[PDB]
Amino acid sequence: ANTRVIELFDEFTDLIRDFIVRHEITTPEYETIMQYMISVGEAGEWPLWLDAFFETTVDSVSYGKGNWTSSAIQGPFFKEGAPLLTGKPATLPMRADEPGDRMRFTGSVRDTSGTPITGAVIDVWHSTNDGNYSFFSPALPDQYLLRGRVVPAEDGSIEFHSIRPVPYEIPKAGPTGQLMNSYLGRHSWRPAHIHIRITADGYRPLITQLYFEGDPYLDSDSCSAVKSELVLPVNKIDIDGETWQLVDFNFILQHN
Amino acid sequence: ANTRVIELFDEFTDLIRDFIVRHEITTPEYETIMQYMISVGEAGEWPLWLDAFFETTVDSVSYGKGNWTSSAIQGPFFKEGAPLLTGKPATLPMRADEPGDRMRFTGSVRDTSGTPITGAVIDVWHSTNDGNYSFFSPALPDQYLLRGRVVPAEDGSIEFHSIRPVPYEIPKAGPTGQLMNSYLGRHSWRPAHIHIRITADGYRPLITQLYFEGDPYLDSDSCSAVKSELVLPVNKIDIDGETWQLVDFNFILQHN
Numbered sequence A, B: 001a002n003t004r005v006i007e008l009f010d011e012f013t014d015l016i017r018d019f020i021v022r023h024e025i026t027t028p029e030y031e032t033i034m035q036y037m038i039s040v041g042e043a044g045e046w047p048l049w050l051d052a053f054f055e056t057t058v059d060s061v062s063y064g065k066g067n068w069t070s071s072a073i074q075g076p077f078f079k080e081g082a083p084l085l086t087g088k089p090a091t092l093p094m095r096a097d098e099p100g101d102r103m104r105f106t107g108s109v110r111d112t113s114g115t116p117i118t119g120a121v122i123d124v125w126h127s128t129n130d131g132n133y134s135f136f137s138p139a140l141p142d143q144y145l146l147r148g149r150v151v152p153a154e155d156g157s158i159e160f161h162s163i164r165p166v167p168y169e170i171p172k173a174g175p176t177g178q179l180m181n182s183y184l185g186r187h188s189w190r191p192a193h194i195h196i197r198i199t200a201d202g203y204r205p206l207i208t209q210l211y212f213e214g215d216p217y218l219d220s221d222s223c224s225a226v227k228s229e230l231v232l233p234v235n236k237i238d239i240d241g242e243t244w245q246l247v248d249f250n251f252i253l254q255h256n
């Protein structure tokens, strides 16, 4: 689109060139940068690397604060074609003895006023206790597991159980890992989270994630994605052997 | 941990983050970028694209103007290992019936004091008429074509023969070319240039380029790397009833 790209480019160009000058970026520097950017290309990191530092912001622009439910970063992990789920307590598809703490999510889907949005479909997915997002892991089938679509009751409410997601270290060994881990000498962890997308004819898509109080990497997310409005109050319930974690959330929507 | 790296990178990201924001960079735009960035690596174009937009700027910090020869950007197409050329007249390795006007290059290398620098070796590389560089074109073989190393005579003069470069167009079909030609509605032409590198014990290495007077793209370089001081007159002075191009430059080197 010619005129828009023309605008941004030139301004982008000047921005970097000015960055190069003010910091007298030398040739070996240039060369390391270029080398590095090649690295990222050579592995599959661009959506990873870009989503890590920049989408939080591409996000803040696209949907922006206010009394909706706040969006959050989509991530390089979504997968279309999730199953419609409808069972006893409507569970995410998971292996047997999928490990560690069991989880319960409860909530609403109402519009500005507060009137339940019946025609909502609602995708959700999240990483195994073990840091792996199926479809993106040698360890895991290329199937629907901890992924799935859920419909709201006409009363408003929704429910699903899954397992409790936990802190994920982005590949220590990736260009992004090295950048986060070694050169910047910080860490490659995100807080425990659950990604969520919500369609509805006649409203505006929403895409967000939720995290957990007492989450050690809340203040320090690698991907600077955590808004506070989206940290989950967490009830640790001990239904014998299997310790459960229950969580509640009320979604409100854009509404075209 | 790298504090240069810490400091530049944080600023780098805050800028980009600023940039995204003031310009309302929308998700679809974001993705097109990512898609672009990716397709740049796939075309192995980082060192193309990057040098085209930024090497001019890195060049100007990390080497200064003065009574020695002005440097210029290296570009993506340098190769280490070109052969020493020693000859009746030294001649760059060239395919049979290699298309273009026969060019004859003369000059010298001396120091800021006037003394010939007899210990210098001069790398030279330029494109084929056809606008291709060896080792960087699937249309030429990975062998040293139109690359070689000349050394000056005891009296410090240099001479090589070769074909005379012509204006070069970054392939319109690349991601880089597509950006420049289509997306920005500009062109992607550089003027005929000869890349030079001089190294010599005692001296700071020089990498530069030589342009030709009249060169139609002179006032309009895609990479925007021409410098008036580096535009050689061309003397079309014929011999054996055949059409030579005569070009002469005197190199001057800084000490250390």
Ligand SMILES: Oc1ccc(O)c(O)c1
Binding pocket: B048, B051, B052, B074, B075, B076, B077, B168, B190, B195, B223
């Ligand atoms: O950025 C560039 C592109 C093409 C060239 O021939 C060159 O020397 C530099």
Ligand SMILES: [Cl-]
Binding pocket: B080, B081
């Ligand atoms: Cl060598």
Ligand SMILES: [Fe+3]
Binding pocket: A075, A077, A127, A193, A195
């Ligand atoms: Fe995730």
